[PDB]
Design a protein around this ligand. Structure first.
Ligand SMILES: Nc1ncnc2c1ncn2[C@@H]1O[C@H](COP(=O)(O)OP(=O)(O)O)[C@@H](O)[C@H]1O
Ligand SMILES: Nc1ncnc2c1ncn2[C@@H]1O[C@H](COP(=O)(O)OP(=O)(O)O)[C@@H](O)[C@H]1O
Ligand SMILES: [Mg+2]
Ligand SMILES: [Mg+2]
Lengths: 460, 466
């Protein structure tokens, strides 16, 4: 009766597509679109390239409701040896490195490929040309779910005359355009508003074409790989850090070199609290001494914040400008908080508030959520951002009536966003994140008070 | 600058524990408790055994806030050779078959084990004796994250002089008792109310003990493994089915032998609609033919409903009894609907309504969600159940004011529950399930409508006397 069996990562997601954001054809179409766009953006702005991204969705089969999604970008491309695994091996990524990107699981595109395979028979099509490559490399791929490995259906190359570079991805999937339409449009519009150095073109299944022109040629400094912040690094992470050392570091040397925010004196203070010999060889840490390091990191109250430069923010100015373009308010304000850390990861919370003007009258605020520059559209009431907004008492900040015109926007960015599911539509209840979102909203809420106070004496 | 790497299933969950319901210490404590409890129930009532479950949570270290969770059951135990993979290999399960169980990913207990070693240094402790085994096998285990394999730290054996069968699992993890407390108690109380054939004992970190006595000695008929129903079976699944074949079946034989609700006549019609040659050997099906089968499965309107043999319901009588006991309403009603299918999986929705009486007054219903007899506690407003309850027009069913006292209960059971996350706290928006939940709710709301029309009519008669 009990037969014990194993699954591959590919079989796991094929059996549970709702875990990756593929619960139904409408959400699947939306998910496939944003995974491709986010890959294209990670392939451009992370590498100092002004993104030029084209999105096409065609209805291929009316009766069967199969759509072909094609995204083309001018990004860094993919080395041809890596393409099969990049697109056809679940849990394969170039972004497992400690660095702020949109992608993070090494699942995304493969979830769409699995969903594609589940329901129709055309392979995914990849065309790619790395910087300086004299060839465009072409592929048609499927995934062997049992082995979790790519099946190469076609593989070829052509000479690249108009010597340009980037990647085109096309995937055919079940979809529901009429149901996904408003959200696909909103996803692209919100991305665009916060990514003014990007240019998008969107051709939809009805044949509408929408142009989103570049507004500036200045890209924010690209996020880089950074060292972990000590606060919240766990025991398994300590072991990984040790196992990856080239040099025979002592524990002291380990602390100042492998982490952010640890100078020579901070190192000493930690080693004392943790009860570790500074000169002992870190390769020799016992199971117990690792426990003592981790607990010390967790308790130490005098850690400097991580470098803000670790991350890529939207910015106070862009945030306020955005709130004025869309909402045409009587008042807006924003803050880009100083960095904090959670589980070894630097993060910044930004928050913005708008009030009055063309903002609809309602019983709750309109809440706008972003994480690593991605607009979140689904599952809003499950989000920690919504929880904090809900729990805050807006009467303590001027909100007189139970009916008001208010927009609240929160952006979380980090080397790691803790999402509730691999679908990445909502942020989990991580304690340090929840507290800082609350502190951030309070700062901007105080500014709203100062206005609603001055504005009240006018009616008085 | 880009370096490509892979992760094992263990490293995946270790890097992202929030995906398996381990976002913070409070929720970790709650998740660990509920994973152990569900495994214990799956080891007992799935095999016809009346569950006796003991849960203890001890505070081991006040400063580090480490708690040791221990759950002991009288289940079937585990063959000693399977113990290391069962607790220490991510994506390893005895329940990847077509049968209703609480467990479903082969993740749960390992996610607790990972959280355990990420934060403290004591191995998890397993003690087990299978049915009829002369021995009690003990294990201490860790996981090698990189390889996704068990490390046997200690392994031992002892003579089972008392004929005991079952398992004890004990795991030390960071926790937060004061924040997790009310939900852990509510989880246990909720499961007990719908599992009256079980007995629980719960000792909490404060040294409080609660006893939940068995109220009936009848066990529901255990769910059995069944063949897939054709409706919604996808292409990869068709391939899996073909590949597991030990015979050289024709397509016709494949259809009649591999599925529920297909006999000779239904097969003939399916072969006709799909444009498939009945005599062709199914091992030779082309990619395009598989697509045709699948679409035909998807559009065929004459399939018989699946049996409920693979399912285990709470049942109308118990739903109503439980609603009355807890809420002391003026009215309650319930419905256990007929089975349907989605994605090849038989499913049943049960619904319950309670109104008035001891129910608190509020602006919205109290919603009680269950999946495969597990009470769902967190993330309620993301649940498809919430979505359906919220969109229903309660004025159409006699709910006059903006304020009322109502409880609504929905249980989905199936060989596969589509949760939104591996933490299994909310059900995703799958169309077939959404429609049937709406249907069930409407059937139970019509019963409420009737109660309230009765009350109104009497008031109207009484108004004339004024
Ligand atoms: N358009 C693209 N341009 C360059 N690289 C890409 C592109 N699309 C996908 N990739 C590569 O494929 C890998 C796997 O992508 P994905 O499955 O979506 O996971 P993730 O984005 O989380 O790493 C990425 O890490 C990236 O290296
Ligand atoms: N208390 C128990 N009694 C019997 N078997 C157990 C017990 N706990 C765990 N198992 C076995 O270990 C396997 C892995 O459990 P778990 O990681 O929770 O995944 P899942 O429950 O989805 O199968 C189970 O399928 C079950 O066979
Ligand atoms: Mg991606
Ligand atoms: Mg389980």
């Amino acid at each position: 009766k009990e037969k014990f069996t194993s699954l591959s990562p590919a079989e796991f997601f094929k059996r549970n597509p709702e875990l990756a954001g593929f619960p139904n054809p409408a959400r699947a179409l939306y998910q496939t679109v944003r995974e491709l766009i986010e890959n294209s953006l990670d392939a451009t702005d992370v590498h100092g390239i002004l993104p030029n991204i084209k999105i096409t969705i065609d209805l291929i089969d009316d009766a069967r409701q199969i759509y072909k999604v094609n995204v083309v970008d001018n990004g860094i491309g993919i080395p041809p040896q890596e393409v099969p695994n990049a697109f056809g091996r679940v849990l394969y990524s170039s972004k497992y490195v400690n660095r702020q990107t949109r992608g993070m699981y090494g699942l995304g595109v493969k979830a769409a490929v699995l969903y594609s395979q589940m329901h129709q028979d055309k392979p995914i099509e990849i065309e790619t040309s790395p910087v300086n490559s004299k060839r465009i490399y072409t592929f048609k791929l499927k995934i062997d779910i049992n082995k979790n490995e790519p099946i190469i259906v076609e593989r070829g190359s052509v000479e690249n005359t108009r010597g340009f570079h980037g990647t085109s991805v096309a995937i055919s999937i079940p979809g529901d355009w009429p149901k996904a339409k408003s959200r696909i449009y909103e996803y692209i519009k919100r991305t665009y508003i916060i990514t003014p150095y990007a240019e998008f073109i969107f051709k939809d299944p009805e044949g509408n074409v929408t142009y989103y022109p570049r507004l500036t040629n200045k890209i924010p400094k690209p996020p880089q790989e950074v060292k972990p912040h000590p606060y919240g690094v766990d025991r398994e992470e300590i072991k990984i850090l040790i196992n990856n050392l080239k040099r025979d570091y002592t524990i002291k040397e380990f602390l100042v070199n492998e982490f952010q925010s640890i100078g020579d004196t901070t190192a000493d203070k930690i080693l004392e609290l943790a009860g570790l010999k500074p000169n002992k060889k870190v390769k020799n840490l016992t199971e117990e001494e690792i426990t003592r390091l981790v607990e010390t990191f967790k308790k130490y109250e005098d850690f400097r914040s991580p470098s803000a430069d670790s991350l890529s923010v939207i910015g106070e100015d862009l945030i306020e400008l955005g709130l004025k373009k869309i909402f045409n308010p009587d008042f807006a304000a924003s803050i880009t908080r100083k960095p904090k850390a959670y589980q070894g990861h630097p993060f910044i919370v930004e928050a913005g508030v708008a009030f009055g003007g063309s903002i609809p009258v309602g019983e709750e605020p309109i809440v706008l959520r972003y994480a690593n520059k991605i607009p979140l559209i689904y599952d809003e009431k499950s989000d920690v951002i919504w929880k904090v907004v809900e729990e805050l008492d807006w009467k303590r900040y001027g909100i007189e009536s139970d009916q008001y015109q208010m927009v609240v926007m929160v952006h979380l960015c980090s080397t790691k966003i803790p999402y509730k599911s691999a679908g990445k539509e909502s942020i989990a209840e991580v304690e340090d994140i929840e507290k800082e979102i609350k502190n951030a909203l309070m700062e901007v809420a105080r500014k709203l008070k100062q206005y609603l106070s001055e504005k009240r004496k006018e009616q008085e």
